[PDB]
């Protein structure tokens, strides 16, 4: 007997790590778990095709932001039973619990697997040579921009590249998500969507959201981000940070784990950046401090022929032992709140900064139409980045683009 599991590349050897994670389960149940690894870029298509076609695995990893969308298609097995065996609502951060179902659904359709949230990695050697105190740079928007200005005027050169660093790297080219943009929207007092007595609408074109978006996009128009970096997706920006090409960038806690892994095994431990690595939270904006809080859950397709055995695997993957071990293998945080207390997370100095930054963590609402909203937002945000690359992003042009994005988003939400 066999379970099929789909997962995304959460660890450097995603298939091998997952297999090693489920080995005790395989031994004890006398079952094989076959895993297929999907790139995040193809995962949405593969999972929605399994949903519509009725062909796919027993279990899939689902980004937290996708749970609502796939759940609304009516294809997921209820897992209230698994969540009750794992300790129920009390055992989860309420922000994590809200990702176990479509907003306002009767039944849970996803088991929390891991959490991740966003902060700034920074080069400790570069900030020092620029005369930047990270406690000032990462306090406030004004401290953030003043730090980038000292980084731009720095005479520091990476000891391996023999070249200057860019103050900030952020991806322009593949905006697959709003995750990079959301903290800036939120810190201005904005939102991506807003509910008015029931109905959801875009707030991307609200004065507050436009203020946050303009603040962030204009850092790049001011010369703090190289034009190069707007050519690049997330994976290429990570590589540029690892190769010593920039002083600061936003990512999740997986980069700490990759930094202690040799290059031979998919890490960057021998690079200067890994040996001079700091983490600081997103700076507070004029209306508050927020960061993107997400992660992945696991779900069971209602066409599975092995629902009992698959629920046993969900309970195992959701539980204390597998929660600590998978978070170690990935550099993610446990989804299970109790597991955060494991000394191996609490005593990691860079990871403790992610753990404290979770006080300000913020999630998207769990909407049926979420896939559509994110897809439409990034399409329009992509065009704003195109204006940045040409030095032509004005507040008027940004507003014009988010007015169009909001019409597209509202039309999709009315369905
Ligand atoms: O939007 C899909 C989910 O994204 C998750 O973050 C991913 C990101 O998409 C990848 O590009 C790569 O960087 O890995 C990240 C961590 O898995 C996010 O955690 C989820 O909440 C989203 O649903
Ligand atoms: Cl929002």
Ligand 1 atom with the shortest distance to the CA of 363: 21
Helix (H) or strand (E) holding 291: strand 291-300
Resolution of the solved structure (Å): 2.1
Method of elucidation: X-ray
Ligand 1, residues 67, 177, 295: which to mutate, most atoms within 8 A of Cβ?
A: 177
Ligand 1 atom with the shortest distance to the CA of 294: 21
Q: Is the CB of 116 under 6 A from ligand 1?
A: yes
CB 408 within 8 A of CB 380: yes
Angle between helices 307-318 and 14-29 (to 10 degrees): 120
Scan for tokens 């590349």, then name that residue: 9
The single-letter DSSP state of residue 358 is: G
Q: How far is the CA of 182 from the centre of ligand 2 (A)?
A: 8
Q: What contacts 94, CB < 8 A, 6 or more positions away?
A: none
Q: How far is the CA of 169 from the centre of ligand 2 (A)?
A: 24
- Helix, coil or strand: residue 28: helix
Ligand 1 atom with the shortest distance to the CA of 44: 2
Ligand 1 atom with the shortest distance to the CA of 65: 23
Q: Is the CB of 363 under 6 A from ligand 1?
A: no
Q: What is the CB neighbour count within 10 angstroms for residue 349?
A: 9
β-strand partners of 298: 61, 111
Q: How far is the CA of 275 from the centre of ligand 2 (A)?
A: 36
Q: What is the CB neighbour count within 10 angstroms for residue 400?
A: 16
Angle between helices 395-413 and 207-221 (to 10 degrees): 130
Q: Is the CB of 40 under 6 A from ligand 1?
A: yes
HSE, CB side, 13 Å, CA atoms: give it for residue 115.
30
Q: What is the CB neighbour count within 10 angstroms for residue 5?
A: 20
Please count the helices (runs of H) and the strands (runs of E) in the chain.
19, 13
Pairing verdict, β 2-7 and 32-37: parallel
Q: Is the CB of 295 under 6 A from ligand 1?
A: yes
Report how far residue 70's alpha carbon sits from residue 76's, in angstroms, rounded to the nearest whole number: 7
Q: How far is the CA of 294 from the centre of ligand 1 (A)?
A: 7
Length of the chain: 415
CB 83 within 8 A of CB 100: yes
Name the residue with the closest Cα to ligand 1, atom 13: 234
What would the DSSP string read from start to end of 188-238?
Answer: TT--SEEEETTEEEE-TTSHHHHHHHHHHHHHHHTTSS-GGGGG--HHHHH
Ligand 1 atom with the shortest distance to the CA of 10: 17
Query: Dihedrals φ, ψ of 17, to 5°?
Result: -65, -45
Report how far residue 231's alpha carbon sits from residue 388's, in angstroms, rounded to the nearest whole number: 12
The bound ligand whose nearest atom lies closest to the alpha carbon of 258 is 1
The residue among 402, 314, 401, 415 whose CA lies nearest residue 371 is 415
HSE, CB side, 13 Å, CA atoms: give it for residue 335.
29
Alpha carbon distances (Å) from 333 to 241, 252, 351, 366: 22, 10, 9, 21
Pairing verdict, β 166-168 and 246-251: parallel
Per-residue burial over 275-302, b = 16 or more CB atoms within 10 Å of its CB, e = otherwise: ebbbbbbbbbbeeebbbbbbbbbbbbbe
Q: How far is the CA of 117 from the centre of ligand 1 (A)?
A: 10
The residue among 270, 271, 238 whose CA lies nearest residue 253 is 238
Name the residue with the closest Cα to ligand 1, atom 21: 294
Discontinuities in the chain (C→N > 2.5 Å), after residue: none
Token pair of 147, please? 């730090």
Report how far residue 61's alpha carbon sits from residue 73's, in angstroms, rounded to the nearest whole number: 16
Q: What is the CB neighbour count within 10 angstroms for residue 163?
A: 10
Q: How far is the CA of 30 from the centre of ligand 1 (A)?
A: 33
Q: Is the CB of 297 under 6 A from ligand 1?
A: no
Q: How far is the CA of 186 from the centre of ligand 2 (A)?
A: 7
Q: Is the CB of 14 under 6 A from ligand 1?
A: no
The bound ligand whose nearest atom lies closest to the alpha carbon of 238 is 1
Report how far residue 238's alpha carbon sits from residue 18's, in angstroms, rounded to the nearest whole number: 23
Q: How far is the CA of 193 from the centre of ligand 2 (A)?
A: 5
Q: Is the CB of 251 under 6 A from ligand 1?
A: no
β-strand partners of 248: 122, 168
CB 250 within 8 A of CB 171: no
Environment of ion ligand 2 (residues, CB < 5 A) = 191-192
Q: How far is the CA of 328 from the centre of ligand 2 (A)?
A: 30
CB 120 within 8 A of CB 280: yes
């Amino acid at each position: 007997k066999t379970l099929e599991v789909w997962i995304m590349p959460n660890s450097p050897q995603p298939a091998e790590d997952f297999k090693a994670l489920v080995a005790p389960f395989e031994k004890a149940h006398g079952v094989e778990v076959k895993v297929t690894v999907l790139d995040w870029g193809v995962a949405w298509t593969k999972i929605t095709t399994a949903a519509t076609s009725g062909v796919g695995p027993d279990l899939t990893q689902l980004g937290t932001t996708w749970v609502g969308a796939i759940s609304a298609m009516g294809v997921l097995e209820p897992v209230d039973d698994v969540l009750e065996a794992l300790g129920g609502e009390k055992a989860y951060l309420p922000a994590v619990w809200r990702t176990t179902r479509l907003e306002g659904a009767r039944q849970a359709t996803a088991v929390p697997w891991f959490s991740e949230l966003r902060a700034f990695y920074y080069r400790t050697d570069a900030l020092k040579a620029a005369g930047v105190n990270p406690a000032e740079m990462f306090a406030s928007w004004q401290g953030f921009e003043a730090g980038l200005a000292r980084l731009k005027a720095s005479s520091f050169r990476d000891p391996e590249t023999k070249a200057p660093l860019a103050p900030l790297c952020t991806p322009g080219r593949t905006p697959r998500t709003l995750h990079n943009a959301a903290p800036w929207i939120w810190g201005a007092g904005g939102e991506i969507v807003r509910q008015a007595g029931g109905r959801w609408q875009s707030a991307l074109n609200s004065p507050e959201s436009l203020e946050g978006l303009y603040f962030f996009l204009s850092l790049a128009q001011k010369g703090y981000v190289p034009a190069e970096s707007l050519e690049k997706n997330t994976a290429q920006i990570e590589a540029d940070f690892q190769a010593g090409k920039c002083a600061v960038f936003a990512s999740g806690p997986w980069m700490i784990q990759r930094a202690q892994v040799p290059e031979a095994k998919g890490g960057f431990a021998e690079r200067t950046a890994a040996k001079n690595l700091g983490v600081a939270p997103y700076p507070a904006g004029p209306k508050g401090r927020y960061t993107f809080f997400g992660g992945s859950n696991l779900a069971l397709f209602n066409f599975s022929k092995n629902k009992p055995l698959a629920k046993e695997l969900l309970k195992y993957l959701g539980g204390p032992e597998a929660q600590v071990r998978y978070a170690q293998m990935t550099g993610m945080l446990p989804a299970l709140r109790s597991a955060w207390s494991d000394p191996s997370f609490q005593q990691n100095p860079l990871l403790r900064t992610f753990i404290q930054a979770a006080q300000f963590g913020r999630t998207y609402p769990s909407l049926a139409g979420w896939g559509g909203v994110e897809n439409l937002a990034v399409q329009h945000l992509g065009m704003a980045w195109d204006l940045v690359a040409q030095g032509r992003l004005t507040r008027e042009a940004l507003k014009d683009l988010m007015d169009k994005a909001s019409a597209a988003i509202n039309q999709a939400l009315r369905h």
